[PDB]
Scaffold this active site. Structure first.
Site, short mmCIF file in Angstrom:
data_model
loop_
_atom_site.label_atom_id
_atom_site.label_comp_id
_atom_site.label_asym_id
_atom_site.label_seq_id
_atom_site.Cartn_x
_atom_site.Cartn_y
_atom_site.Cartn_z
CG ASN A 37 -8.39 44.53 34.12
OD1 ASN A 37 -8.83 44.41 32.98
ND2 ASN A 37 -8.01 43.49 34.85
CG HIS A 48 6.50 43.49 46.22
ND1 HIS A 48 5.68 44.55 46.54
CD2 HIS A 48 6.41 43.34 44.88
CE1 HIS A 48 5.11 45.02 45.45
NE2 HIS A 48 5.54 44.30 44.42
#
Lengths: 160, 149, 160, 158, 158, 149, 160
Positions: free
Chosen positions: D63, D128
């Protein structure tokens, strides 16, 4: 034991802390502005460092509700010292009330030694949808002095 | 009396005395040995590590810790207070105090963000883990005064 | 009369009882493992006897909710005595809370005299679908100490 | 290019992470020094003067937009507080998984006073347990305690 | 001779004068040193260990019986508190009038840490103002302030 | 409030402020200048020299001196206390404190033996003489808190 | 402020001060007595120095009327420190009352490390023309212990 109870507190976020940083930043900014220019060839950006070594400061504080004001003053001193300043280069002036802040600040700002001034105080009431004359005059006076003398003055009052 | 800072100080005092007795030679026999620590802080040196984040609450916690030590016979001259920016670096500072031979116990004080996590929090889990491992390795009591907002 | 009311109770099934038996079995098992080997010619099976004569034990117990913890400790002592142990060879250590169990247990396990350690305590809450930090650390600490020192440590805590 | 420079970077996680490193570096330098005479409770706190200190920065490349604003935030924090740009070592790594191992190499040098770790983490659109994110936090925490040198945590979630 | 040695001399003005000199010598050595860090009220007091200090004694010869017991009292005070007998300089003068001038010469040496003045004064059997006694006190007091070195007063009246 | 130690402290505070104002430049004119000292001890450093002889009384005198300084806004951190064996050596110790550039005033406390002298006392006359000469030479206020038994 | 009020007091003359000096003098005296003899040819005189470096001391103090006893103990410690001793080499034992002083002192005097013992306490009444049993026993016990163990024990009690 009360000496450690009060000394164990921290003073890192109160309005005295931020007022000091603005004075440090503005004082350094002015030195660069009235210095030599850049080499050009690109957009020139000015911004003040946060190094407070070799700078002289003055603090004007009102005496109303000294319980709170005392903590704001201690916050301002801590900010200057922790950024490299010397407690030798701080001048403190106490005044009876908020109405007297602008006149006292005017005296300190005219000295050649000082580089910035910090004003600290507590205003009365304030939490009413009405125009208050004392509050308006104090803000007006500090603003006019800064522009006339070309010296930064920081505004660290609160309402209660 | 009712804050976690008070409780953390008492645990540190009791554990410090208990360790002092264990190193002593065992008894002759004829009964079951029982070891326990007393609540007198006289002659003990303490260290405190506190974080600045959310300072509104910690000052009350550090307040209780110092008050408890003095009230139980401790000398204020023997308290060393260390302040750190946030909770992430409490363990590293606590380790420096625990390695001094002039410190008997260490108290860690801090505040953690809300506990309504989905399943787990990655910063809270490291503070408790680091302090626990540090205590066992150095064989010196370290108390956990951390609370959750 | 209350002395007989409490003395007339039985302590045969509580978690203190089973924790003691595991320590007795493991302590005897280790003596056989690090002894001389068998004659071969067939698969060799190792298993610990339940005779507790000549063995030294140590017990670490937290003080939270002493009403229940006291009964678990009495159960552990009864198990050792009823299997042939001597109350002379038991060391008892009390700690303020659950967070302090692993550090105290580490001190006792390093002595050459003791052959096994029993940890007893009561955890807070526990009945919530969330990860508890104090519970995890206590379990982690005891597990690591046992593997490092190569000495059995039994885990006799409960939730309430 | 001037458009990039005009943006403000005060206050982003790069800024806070660098500021914590400066305070911790000064704090340790005080602790190693001679103890006080006594006669009162003795307090320690780190000053915010960055002159004379050496810093290291480890940043991932994933990123590339977000990371650059964080790295530049850290650098300006050091410079605006008195540090020199000649005393900063920058290391770039493919991804967040290998930050701890690179941070270990920098921290073992005797010329480094603190290390700053910067990166971003991918957030799956259902909550999760992430096996990569936990390992970064676990690894960095262990290194600081073992090497006895402050390491600051400056990652964010996408 | 052994009869002379058997007598006790603890507590006579020679003893007290020497003891004050030891305390003042240590006190000044502390004041010249680095100041305390702070954080509390800072107290000074002189220890009573005399090892490593140099002393000078000026004693008159008038009334040879009384003076000797005073001089020996001073010496034993220094020795019994750790001092060495090789670090004492003794000067003897005809009479009480010329103690101050002799004490001045000793005090100007850089190897002396304190000076002790011992003597006795003749008491006329009617109480008039003594012009000799006043000059000794006046002279000794001026010397200490001017030279900035402690001088102790150990005279008695017959 | 009624002991000479209290009074001596007040005089030291007032004289320290008075000196601070005198060094300031004179006024424009148009009236008679009047100089005086205020009773606020904030920001001032003090030193105290006390004797041990007849310790039963001096502790009450030193008690008053420290109490007065704090009660009038003084910070206890700024008091330096020096103890000497007897009154004969108060002047020499006071001179060492007065020469420090960080001290604004000095207070001397002691007790002298009975005053029923025939005509004169040779030890009392030297303490007062030395302190007075010292103050003028160094141009710094020194207060006399000595009393007679 | 009370911390400086108590710290500003002096402790130079109380019975704790003189008791410490006697212990210092006697401890040094014994080292010379059981050392090598002199060269003769003249009367030999023995006397103890007042240098307290390298000596180990023990102090037993009762707890009755702790306001006064605390000041006597502080006086004893000051005397040792001001004569060159180290606070590291002092052992302090507290006992419930005066009756328990001799038994506690006996325990400390049997250690090989210690060179002298100082007993501090306050007796009850005392100002009556009658024989007091507690006072007599405490004096008797300390005297017997010193002669039996050949180790000096100093007696620093007072009456009130």
């Amino acid at each position: 034991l009360e000496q450690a109870i009060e000394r164990a507190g921290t003073k890192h976020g109160n309005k005295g802390w931020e007022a000091a940083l603005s004075a440090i930043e503005m004082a350094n900014l002015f030195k660069s502005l009235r210095g030599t220019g850049g080499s050009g060839s690109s957009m020139e950006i000015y911004e003040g460092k946060l190094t407070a070594e070799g700078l002289r400061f003055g603090i004007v504080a009102s005496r109303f509700n000294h319980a709170l004001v005392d903590r704001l003053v201690e916050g301002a001193i801590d900010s200057i010292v922790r950024h490299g300043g010397r407690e030798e280069d701080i001048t403190l002036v106490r005044v009876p009330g908020s109405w007297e802040i602008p006149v006292a600040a005017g005296e300190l700002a005219r000295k050649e030694d000082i580089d910035a001034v910090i004003a600290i105080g507590v205003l009365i009431r304030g939490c009413t949808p009405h125009f208050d004359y004392i509050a308006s005059e104090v803000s007006k006076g500090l603003a006019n002095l800064s522009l006339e003398l070309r010296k930064p003055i920081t505004f660290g009052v609160i309402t209660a």
